[PDB]
A = this chain, B = another copy of it.
Amino acid sequence: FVQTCDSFNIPLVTLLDVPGFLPGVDQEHNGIIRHGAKLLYAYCNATVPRISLVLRKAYGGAYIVMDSRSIGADLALAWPTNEIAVMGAEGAAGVIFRRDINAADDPEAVRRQRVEEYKAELMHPYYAAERGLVDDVIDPADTREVLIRGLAMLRTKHADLPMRKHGNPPQ
Within 8 A of B (CB), among A129-171: 161, 164-169, 171
Tell me, yes or no, whether A3 is within 8 Å of chain B by CB: yes
Question: Interface on chain A toward B: helix, strand, loop, or mixed SS?
Answer: loop
A169 to B169, CA, bound (A): 9
Least CB distance from A157 to B in Å reads 13
Copies of this chain held together in the complex:
3
A38 within 8 A of B: yes
Query: Does residue A45 face the partner (Cβ distance < 8 Å to B)?
Result: yes
A167 to chain B: which residues have CB within 8 Å?
7, 166
> Whose C-beta in chain B lies nearest to the C-beta of A38?
B171
Interface residues of A (CB under 8 A from B): 3-4, 6-7, 38, 42, 45, 47, 161, 164-169, 171
**A164 to B171 CA separation, bound complex (whole angstroms):** 20
Is B166 a contact of A7 with CB atoms below 8 Å?
yes
A49 to chain B, nearest CB (A): 14
